[PDB]
């Protein structure tokens, strides 16, 4: 979180923690409760969030779920909307550390080559992600939204 | 809604197929639990303010929700909760006759969800008293219902949970 | 800077028309109006009923002057079609909020008034929800029974002209009425 | 179902409306027996006076079938 | 279905079902079994009932099949066997719910406005329906057709 | 009646009567020879019925009986009686009308509220019809009795 | 409206007695009809449309009626006197299922002499049209059902003159 | 909504300059075009049912979507999409008329994408049945009238997609 | 505009555009170049025509021009002269759309509210505006001058 | 809405306590209070016309507001934004009399920023209207009464921005 990057900072430096450091720090010990309600908010929606995410993303893409498609068939449907399942869970994860980097460590290095491998499309899991996102923001308030806009915001960048 | 002979019908139209022997079984094996689901569905109706009284008792009241500062605290709130209660219960006679579980979904469990987390009700004690009732309505249909009976139920606790 | 059509608009005025029928009216005058009766609260925007829609029996009191326009709505909301199209899909919240904008014209209010209804529905049946708010003062008081329902967003209830143009403009009916023979979703290109 | 044809006349005098308001101030008009009771409420609410009333449907004193 | 019309009432009146309703239920069970039988004849005579209906469909109107006629030319006149091959799909579909609301939402509900695009004449239609009934009826046994007949004669006065 | 539910639901839809609803007419004309006997047989049994059902109900509720208890004194008993003996005959014009539509006009709407002002209580009343039911099913035949039992059902969950 | 059986049951209830023998034969009568009544009714709803342009070719149509100056003349006229012939039939048909005539004085009886009195429609060319969709439904249902078919269109005859 | 004439004089009306030739010059392009509009229109009018039915022929009908399965399956759903044929042509005669395409965005164009996403009905489809209407629709115009109205087709062909 | 109204009254019926409505329109746009003289005239001789009206309307009304009136001041005036030209834009523009809604719109809606916030007498606006008229009659030609006077009477009759 | 008796009522209702003292001292001051309020309110009802006529001549008339371009310019604007300078005076006072800023809340604040956003109307200019208001009244008041109507005026103005 947050505070590991200051930390970390102030240890390249080789220098006690610096006076705005730690007030920055103070300033996140402090909006961490309100940001532990938008991330439970979106837990408990997160079922709906992912249903309706993988229809538009499907409606989006005919050819992810066709027979050529990695998508297709039940147990492929079931995997896509797991890994939609999986970046959500990320993105709770995200808003209450403050930081993107839990989400990083767990899903987005080596993104690439996994799916490569798989040979799932990478655009269009960048389209869940951001279909994800435009029905979790329609849940959240306005500037509950904008915060948690940036973490999935990040993540299309990332699968990009 | 849809029922189990619809459904039939409509996977079988989607295909364009005409109604084959399999269909057909299918639809046998509902006419025969007919007979029993309505017996069930009129020993509900007839018992249905006692059914709710008892799973009240055994979970909702003498509780902290009764008491000052609880969802169910103050005549309103309380009067809301059995009304609920009896919502669900009328809806899964209806899914038992039925013999398919949409109707629940169109009208019960489609943004109840929502509904009672912005209300602040407590979706584990409204499951709680699913269940309860689901116990007290298994003894009344007796056994070959109450199997029958019990699944809607299980259905629409899975939904709110 | 700011043009004319930039807050409210000119539209949403002027796409607002009172209808009274009347006795001596000549029928095609008439039937502009029964039309519009359909149109807003069976939500047929194409603007002219089909057939089968049509309350018959309805229109001939109608036309007769045997019934007033407030009974000629309420007939409607008490016939099985309203039932089919818009009670029996929807949930019983949003069945109200599908009351208040087919009578009414606008959102609903407050959750108590959802409350109510949705109490109205519970316990007693979809016409005596529909009556109640045919009954309600509200309605009497913006359409007494001469004036066909219109879509009015009001604005006086905090927050009811943002509702009012969410339900009005934005949500198109999302739901098939009829169950039977549910959509594939692909076949999209032809 | 039992049916009224009521005629009543209402005067408006809370406020003056432009709009012509003849259809509502003398209305001869067919109500369910059910409605007629909040009907016939409203009318005197308003200060309304309900001319006339009759039963247009329906036999009086019908156990069934009312 | 007749179960589903039975459930909407009540859930309008907001009643659990009355006594007279469920005893309709348990009528229709019973019947059921007879049903699927009637429903299973029409099926396999399929094939036959259309082509026997189709002649005699054209042999009562020889205009349809002519130049200026809808129905005129094999593309043409295949569409409409398969027309007439839908509406003995839906009555089987009838006699196996026991009510026409199955038969109702998927041919009765838009038909005029359909065929007056197509400029498919609905009279035509209508006899054709009418033929496929007295093949129908001839396969089926007295009492069967009486049950046939019904949906049949349903069809027939939806399409005028 | 089945036939007046039947008519009132096809002039709501403006329609003839549908196939469905004119098989369940035909169900119960035939049922109605059987009907009349069911009735008949309550009917004659009808002051033993409501007899043996007082006793029954008095045993059940002491209280109702008793100085405090509406039911006390024998002006009041004779009323419970009379009470008892009208919704019996009620039921028996149920099971002719194959409807609890003749039930429910005379006897079920407007009851809570008649009695409130009496100051019955509803529960005990239903009690009553429950006894009334046990002692009817004993004289007729089971079959008979399953017939019965839905209209002394729907009594009792009407009063409740 | 009402219906037979819940005539004979609404004259019993006015007494007050419990249903007796003579109550029980008038309501064993009606059920032997109704095999019959049920399969005419099912004759005219098919052959309805048939059996109103028989009796408007009969009656209305080739008249003074349709010429200009006529009430059937325009199409908007026209249009509505075929629709009340369709009203007409419908209601006879369900006054012969019933059983009873009252359904027809509560719904199309009950001030239509005023209504067309007022719209000047002719009441005998009226009461004409219905004694000819009379005579074309009593071929169509056969005798026996003829008999039953008949008395509801002549009330509604007298009714209307 | 607004037209040419109410957006010239917008402009100037948050400018606050009176009309000047330059404005005028605009307004008097939009008077000889008028002309030719309106016979257009008349055309379409005429031609409205015929134009939707060849559009439908061009790409809906003989497809996927008239097959079972498709969206365009059963009468209900064939009929809800001419009627939506109907209104857009209705509506693209609209804005023709009035020179301006703003017209489409507040009736037709706001909402529309999502109320097809949640229907399921096909995007792409549409706009394909609404590029054929508008090729009918220029061959029955004229050239000099085609152009005008392709431009309004096309708007309402990106607002979907 | 008059291509905007019968727009709205086509929507409202939810029809194409009648013969009648196209034939208005096309009247509408051979009037349209005429109408464009009769504008430009007006725009050319605006300063003057508000110049001499104001010395009309002050004549007419010496009390708004007094200290007690709201036109009194030289500031005060200065607006009371905006006001008549604000005005006289908008029937220019009223002149070339053919109708009154330009106008109606922009001046029209909320005018008495307006004016009675401000307490300016609304009679003594209408003079000023009728004073224009008179002014604007004599620089137009005479059924140049009928056209321009149908739209300050339109004015004259909204605000009085 | 709540006011500030009922809010102390409400306190101890979810405590299920009765009211005590320490209760009772805080009510006691609302009623101390109350007499002033009521003054005061009595002077801004008569005074309320004027004071959105002073109001708006310091902050809005006169500016870039009403100068075409403007948010304010046109008649139907400019009357739509005194209808605004109303409410919120009449809110404020109703608050006043409440002793709670509760009913600003439910009535005024929620929503009003998403509205006027959309609408495009300056949240800047209308709270400078607000603080306008508030001195005019100030004055008319008198000081006591003063005090406690800023705070309200101040409340909606915190609430735009
Ligand atoms: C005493 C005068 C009568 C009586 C009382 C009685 N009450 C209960 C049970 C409950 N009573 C309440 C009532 C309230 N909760 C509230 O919030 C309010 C308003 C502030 C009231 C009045 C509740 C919630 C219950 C449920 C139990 C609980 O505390 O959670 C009983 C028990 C009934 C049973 O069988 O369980 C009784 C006996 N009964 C009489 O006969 C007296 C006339
Ligand atoms: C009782 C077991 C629990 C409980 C119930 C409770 N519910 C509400 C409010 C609502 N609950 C619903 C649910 C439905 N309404 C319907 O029509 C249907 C489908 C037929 C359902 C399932 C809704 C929509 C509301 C809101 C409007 C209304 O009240 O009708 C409350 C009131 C909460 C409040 O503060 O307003 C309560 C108490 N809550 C409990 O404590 C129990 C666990
Ligand atoms: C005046 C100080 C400023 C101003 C205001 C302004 N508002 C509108 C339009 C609306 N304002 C509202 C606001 C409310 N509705 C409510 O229910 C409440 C709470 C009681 C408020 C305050 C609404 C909903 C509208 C739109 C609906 C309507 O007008 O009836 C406008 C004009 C927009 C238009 O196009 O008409 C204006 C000008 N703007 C300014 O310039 C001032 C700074
Ligand atoms: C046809 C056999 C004859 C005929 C009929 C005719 N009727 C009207 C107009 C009306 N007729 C009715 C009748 C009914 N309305 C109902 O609801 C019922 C009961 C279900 C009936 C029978 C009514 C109310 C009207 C007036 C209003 C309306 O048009 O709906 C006309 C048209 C008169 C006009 O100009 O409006 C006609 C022609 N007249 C004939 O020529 C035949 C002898
Ligand atoms: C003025 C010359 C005389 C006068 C008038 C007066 N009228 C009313 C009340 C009503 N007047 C009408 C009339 C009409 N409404 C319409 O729609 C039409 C046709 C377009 C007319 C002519 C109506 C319906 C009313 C009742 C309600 C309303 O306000 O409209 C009153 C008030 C009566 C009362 O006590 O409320 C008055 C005074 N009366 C005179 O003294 C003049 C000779
Ligand atoms: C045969 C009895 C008559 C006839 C038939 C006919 N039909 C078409 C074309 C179509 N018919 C349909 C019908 C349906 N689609 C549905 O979903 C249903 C209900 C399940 C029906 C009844 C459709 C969709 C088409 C269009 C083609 C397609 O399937 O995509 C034609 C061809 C006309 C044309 O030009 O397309 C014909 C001839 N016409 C007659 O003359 C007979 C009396
Ligand atoms: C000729 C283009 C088509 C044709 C004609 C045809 N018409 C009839 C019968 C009638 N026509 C009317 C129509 C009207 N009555 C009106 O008042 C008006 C409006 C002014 C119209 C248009 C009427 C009332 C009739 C019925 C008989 C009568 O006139 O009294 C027929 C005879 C009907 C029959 O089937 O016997 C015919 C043949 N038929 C075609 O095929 C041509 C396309
Ligand atoms: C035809 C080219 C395509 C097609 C059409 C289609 N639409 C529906 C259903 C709806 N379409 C709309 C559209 C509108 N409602 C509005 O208010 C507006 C703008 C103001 C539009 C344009 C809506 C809301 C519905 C739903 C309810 C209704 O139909 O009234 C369907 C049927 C979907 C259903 O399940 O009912 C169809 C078939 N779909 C295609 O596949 C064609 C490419
Ligand atoms: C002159 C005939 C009369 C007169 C004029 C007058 N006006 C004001 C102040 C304002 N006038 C307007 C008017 C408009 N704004 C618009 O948008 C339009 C339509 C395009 C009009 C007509 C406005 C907004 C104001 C407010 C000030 C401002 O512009 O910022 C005054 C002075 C106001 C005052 O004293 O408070 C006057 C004098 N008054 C008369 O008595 C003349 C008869």
């Known amino acids: 979180?947050?505070?590991?990057?200051?930390?970390?900072?102030?240890?390249?430096?080789?220098?006690?923690?610096?006076?705005?450091?730690?007030?920055?720090?103070?300033?996140?010990?402090?909006?961490?409760?309100?940001?532990?309600?938008?991330?439970?908010?979106?837990?408990?929606?997160?079922?709906?969030?992912?249903?309706?995410?993988?229809?538009?993303?499907?409606?989006?893409?005919?050819?992810?779920?066709?027979?050529?498609?990695?998508?297709?068939?039940?147990?492929?449907?079931?995997?896509?909307?797991?890994?939609?399942?999986?970046?959500?869970?990320?993105?709770?994860?995200?808003?209450?550390?403050?930081?993107?980097?839990?989400?990083?460590?767990?899903?987005?290095?080596?993104?690439?080559?996994?799916?490569?491998?798989?040979?799932?499309?990478?655009?269009?899991?960048?389209?869940?992600?951001?279909?994800?996102?435009?029905?979790?923001?329609?849940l959240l308030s306005g500037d509950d939204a904008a915060e948690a806009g940036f973490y999935f915001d990040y993540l299309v960048g990332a699968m990009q | 809604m849809q029922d189990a002979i619809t459904a039939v019908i409509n996977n079988y139209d989607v295909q364009?197929?005409?109604?084959?022997?399999?269909?057909?079984?299918?639809?046998?094996?509902?006419?025969?639990?007919?007979?029993?689901?309505?017996?069930?569905?009129?020993?509900?109706?007839?018992?249905?303010?006692?059914?709710?009284?008892?799973?009240?008792?055994?979970?909702?009241?003498?509780?902290?929700?009764?008491?000052?500062?609880?969802?169910m605290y103050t005549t309103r709130r309380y009067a809301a909760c059995i009304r609920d209660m009896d919502y669900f219960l009328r809806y899964a006679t209806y899914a038992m006759?039925?013999?398919?579980?949409?109707?629940?979904?169109?009208?019960?469990?489609?943004?109840?969800?929502?509904?009672?987390?912005?209300?602040?009700?407590?979706?584990?004690?409204?499951?709680?008293?699913?269940?309860?009732?689901?116990?007290?309505?298994?003894?009344?249909?007796?056994?070959?219902?109450?199997?029958?009976?019990?699944?809607?139920?299980?259905?629409?606790?899975?939904?709110?949970? | 800077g700011q043009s004319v059509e930039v807050g409210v608009?000119?539209?949403?005025?002027?796409?607002?028309?009172?209808?009274?029928?009347?006795?001596?009216?000549?029928?095609?005058?008439?039937?502009?109006?029964?039309?519009?009766?359909?149109?807003?609260?069976?939500?047929?925007?194409?603007?002219?009923?089909?057939?089968?829609?049509?309350?018959?029996?309805?229109?001939?009191?109608?036309?007769?002057?045997?019934?007033?326009?407030?009974?000629?709505?309420?007939?409607?909301?008490?016939?099985?079609?309203?039932?089919?199209?818009?009670?029996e899909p929807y949930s019983s919240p949003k069945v109200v909020e599908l009351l208040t904008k087919h009578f009414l014209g606008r959102a609903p209010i407050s959750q108590q008034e959802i409350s109510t209804y949705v109490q109205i529905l519970g316990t007693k049946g979809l016409a005596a929800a529909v009556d109640a708010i045919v009954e309600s003062p509200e309605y009497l008081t913006i359409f007494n029974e001469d004036i066909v329902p219109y879509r009015r967003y009001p604005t006086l209830p905090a927050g009811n002209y943002r509702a009012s143009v969410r339900v009005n403009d934005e949500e198109l009916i999302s739901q098939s009425w009829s169950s039977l023979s549910p959509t594939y979703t692909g076949y999209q290109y032809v | 179902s039992r049916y009224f044809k009521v005629t009543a006349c209402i005067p408006s005098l809370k406020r003056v409306r432009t709009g012509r308001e003849l259809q509502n101030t003398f209305f001869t008009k067919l109500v369910p027996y059910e409605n007629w009771f909040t009907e016939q409420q409203r009318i005197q609410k308003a200060g309304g006076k309900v001319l006339s009333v009759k039963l247009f449907t329906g036999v009086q004193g019908a156990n069934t079938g009312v």
Chains 1, 5, 6, 9 share one sequence.
């Open chain 1, 1 to 138: 979180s947050v505070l590991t990057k200051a930390i970390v900072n102030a240890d390249a430096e080789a220098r006690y923690l610096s006076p705005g450091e730690l007030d920055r720090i103070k300033s996140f010990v402090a909006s961490g409760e309100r940001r532990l309600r938008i991330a439970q908010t979106l837990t408990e929606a997160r079922e709906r969030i992912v249903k309706q995410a993988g229809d538009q993303l499907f409606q989006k893409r005919p050819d992810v779920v066709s027979p050529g498609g990695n998508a297709y068939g039940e147990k492929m449907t079931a995997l896509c909307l797991r890994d939609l399942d999986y970046y959500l869970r990320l993105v709770t994860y995200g808003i209450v550390a403050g930081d993107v980097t839990p989400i990083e460590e767990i899903g987005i290095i080596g993104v690439k080559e996994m799916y490569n491998s798989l040979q799932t499309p990478i655009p269009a899991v960048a389209e869940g992600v951001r279909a994800m996102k435009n029905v979790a923001t329609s």
């Open chain 3, 9 to 87: 608009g000119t539209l949403r005025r002027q796409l607002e028309h009172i209808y009274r029928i009347a006795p001596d009216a000549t029928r095609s005058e008439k039937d502009v109006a029964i039309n519009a009766i359909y149109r807003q609260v069976l939500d047929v925007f194409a603007g002219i009923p089909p057939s089968y829609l049509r309350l018959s029996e309805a229109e001939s009191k109608l036309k007769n002057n045997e019934i007033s326009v407030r009974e000629f709505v309420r007939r409607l909301g008490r016939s099985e079609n309203y039932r089919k199209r818009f009670f």
């Open chain 2, 16 to 71: 364009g197929k005409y109604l084959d022997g399999a269909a057909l079984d299918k639809l046998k094996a509902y006419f025969t639990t007919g007979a029993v689901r309505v017996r069930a569905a009129a020993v509900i109706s007839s018992n249905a303010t006692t059914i709710i009284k008892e799973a009240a008792a055994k979970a909702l009241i003498y509780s902290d929700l009764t008491r000052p500062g609880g969802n």
């Open chain 2, 97 to 161: 006759l039925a013999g398919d579980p949409s109707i629940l979904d169109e009208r019960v469990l489609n943004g109840l969800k929502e509904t009672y987390n912005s209300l602040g009700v407590p979706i584990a004690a409204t499951v709680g008293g699913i269940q309860a009732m689901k116990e007290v309505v298994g003894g009344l249909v007796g056994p070959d219902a109450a199997k029958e009976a019990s699944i809607y139920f299980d259905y629409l606790s899975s939904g709110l949970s």
